[PDB]
């Protein structure tokens, strides 16, 4: 036991079917005539049709309600994989290089292998660095963050 | 003549590490044929000390000093010995002039000034200009040092000659 406890926080995503009720003539919608715009190339011509609609709310209060009626699946795995801070804070290193290498090897995190344009972009601007697993069987990885 | 100037500058830059001084040569129909001059690929040189030891090998001898063993599986210390042997050759720059010329007239056509003790003309069907390095580690150089010259053609064939420092430097060193 390292001498301190920790609480994990995880978010899971469910796929649901919704139900809504709306009162009669609760909102007024005014529609205008369509407008057609032409865009001509050499081989073909593309036409764009745009319709303008205006909505105004006529309720003195809430005239519509919503219910989450039914659920059938979990998108996420509801797992216990912890969030990799080395991915979210990639620029940070220990000031002594040998101990930095030792820590990175012990944690199972791989140093960026060579100085490259994609590595520079990942360090400076950020990118989807994690890459997908070879096979996905439980859905998305709901990463647990620790306090 | 640009090859000589470049080689002189390069050897000046490398002298602190290499301790090799530049030696400028001209080759003509007395050393190679017209076809050989037209098709020349590389020129290589090697330094050999008074004891017969090449420069690139270890000072205290090598495993190569052992006798060969006649075993096909051993070749002759095959890969390691091949690497050691190749390591001792060094590559030099060269340029070919493929048409007949007079050497002194050619040099004067370039920017060089020429002032010899005797101004006899020398005519050659073609000329190869190259610079070789001669090793002088102690800042001393012994007349018994030997230098090798290798010419290589596209098919991989080669021709070798060797020279000893006395013939190259007898009066030139005594003059300085």
């Amino acid at each position: 036991h390292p001498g301190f406890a920790l609480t994990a926080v995880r978010t899971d995503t469910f796929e649901v079917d919704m139900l809504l009720y709306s009162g009669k003539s609760c909102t007024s919608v005014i529609i205008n005539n369509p407008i057609v715009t032409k865009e001509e190339r050499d081989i073909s011509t593309t036409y764009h049709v745009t319709q303008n609609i205006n909505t105004v709310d006529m309720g003195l209060g809430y005239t519509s309600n919503t219910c989450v009626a039914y659920v059938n699946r979990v998108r996420t795995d509801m797992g216990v994989r912890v969030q990799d801070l080395f991915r979210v804070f990639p620029m940070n290193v220990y000031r002594h290089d040998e101990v930095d290498r030792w820590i990175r090897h012990a944690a199972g995190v791989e140093r960026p292998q060579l100085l490259d344009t994609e590595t520079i972009s990942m360090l400076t601007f950020g990118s989807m660095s994690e890459r997908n697993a070879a096979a996905t069987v439980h859905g998305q990885k709901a990463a647990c963050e620790l306090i | 003549m640009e090859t000589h100037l470049y080689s002189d500058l390069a050897f000046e830059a490398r002298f602190a590490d290499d301790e090799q001084l530049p030696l400028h040569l001209v080759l003509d129909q007395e050393v190679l044929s017209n076809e050989e001059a037209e098709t020349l690929r590389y020129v290589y040189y090697r330094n050999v000390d008074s004891a017969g030891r090449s420069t690139g090998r270890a000072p205290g001898g090598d495993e190569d000093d052992a006798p060969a063993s006649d075993d096909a599986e051993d070749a002759v210390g095959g890969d390691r010995a091949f690497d050691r042997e190749r390591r001792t050759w060094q590559r030099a720059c060269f340029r070919v002039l493929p048409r007949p010329l007079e050497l002194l007239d050619y040099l004067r056509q370039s920017g060089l000034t020429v002032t010899l003790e005797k101004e006899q003309r020398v005519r050659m069907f073609y000329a190869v200009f190259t610079t070789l390095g001669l090793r002088c580690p102690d800042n001393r150089l012994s007349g018994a040092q030997t230098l090798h010259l290798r010419l290589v053609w596209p098919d991989g064939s080669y021709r070798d000659w060797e020279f000893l420092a006395r013939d190259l430097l007898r009066e030139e060193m005594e003059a300085n």
């Binding site: 715009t37 | 500058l9 830059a13 720059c93």
Partner: protein
């Protein structure tokens, strides 16, 4: 080519009147698309405290430029100009244009906040259209000012940066913001400076070996001049050290490959900085000078 922009916020008549004054301004769009929301106008999308001039310049490279045409009650009409035709544009820069100028687009360094159209934490920010010499000068002034950042304790370097901030351009003077805040430099400018220093350092090392490699093939006079120049550089650089710089010959293949690849990847960073984008050419300018006619070079 027509682009429609709609406001889902609640405009007032004052907002419309403030908007109609920008009738011929240059508005950048993230992507060409028939119908867009007002959130995608201008540079407000990209602004954040951790990035600055370099990132905005890089983003402005790939954006698409549009001109404005007057307004419906709620919708903005934008026009994508075609190459070679001529249009009227608004002078949003800090300097006055004149006939024959080539105009570049730059992120705004400062405002005036006089007429910002603000709609709930969103505001319309437009880039500067300035003549090419001014863009070049301020770009390289910012780059130089970034390099001085690391040792600004001395008084002479502070005087240097003070002189470097001020710029005068044909009867107009203004002060460029300092790229260092709280003794620190933002990440994009830091990477730019690091890349250019790395390029110089790598070149100084690799050039001699590649001179030798090429001279082995042919020994033209140009290589002799390069060799002499590098020998002079090494001699002057080594004046503060004993013995010799002692460059070796037996370099490992992996080290050589890594060095060359690093040199080129560092070169790729600078390509946004070394070139200015010139897209306009002003034929006629009004005496009022706040607007002009230009040929589109995009």
């Amino acid at each position: 080519a027509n682009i429609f922009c709609t406001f889902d916020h609640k405009l007032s008549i004052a907002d419309v009147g403030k908007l109609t004054k920008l009738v011929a301004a240059v508005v950048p769009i993230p992507q060409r698309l028939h119908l867009i929301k007002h959130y995608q106008l201008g540079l407000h999308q990209f602004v954040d405290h951790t990035r600055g001039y370099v990132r905005l310049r890089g983003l402005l490279r790939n954006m698409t430029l549009t001109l404005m045409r007057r307004v419906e009650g709620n919708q903005i009409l934008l026009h994508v100009p075609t190459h070679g035709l001529l249009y009227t544009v608004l002078n949003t820069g800090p300097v006055t244009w004149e006939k024959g100028d080539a105009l570049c687009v730059l992120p705004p360094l400062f405002h005036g906040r006089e007429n910002l159209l603000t709609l709930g934490q969103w505001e319309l920010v437009l880039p500067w259209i300035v003549p090419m010499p001014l863009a070049l000068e301020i770009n390289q002034r910012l780059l130089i000012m970034g390099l001085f950042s690391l040792d600004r304790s001395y008084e002479e370097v502070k005087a240097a940066v003070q002189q470097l901030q001020t710029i005068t351009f044909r009867d107009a003077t203004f002060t460029i913001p300092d790229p260092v805040i709280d003794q620190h430099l933002l990440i994009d400018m830091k990477t730019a400076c690091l890349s250019m220093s790395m390029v110089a350092n790598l070149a100084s090392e690799l050039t001699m070996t590649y001179v030798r490699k090429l001279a082995l093939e042919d020994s033209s006079m140009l290589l002799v001049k390069c060799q002499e120049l590098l020998m002079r550089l090494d001699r002057e650089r080594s004046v503060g050290e004993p013995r010799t710089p002692a460059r070796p010959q037996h370099v490992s293949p992996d080290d050589e490959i890594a060095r060359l690849s690093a040199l080129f990847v560092m070169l790729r960073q600078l390509d946004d900085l070394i070139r200015e984008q010139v897209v306009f050419t002003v034929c006629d300018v009004s005496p009022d000078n706040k607007s002009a006619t230009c040929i589109f070079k995009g």
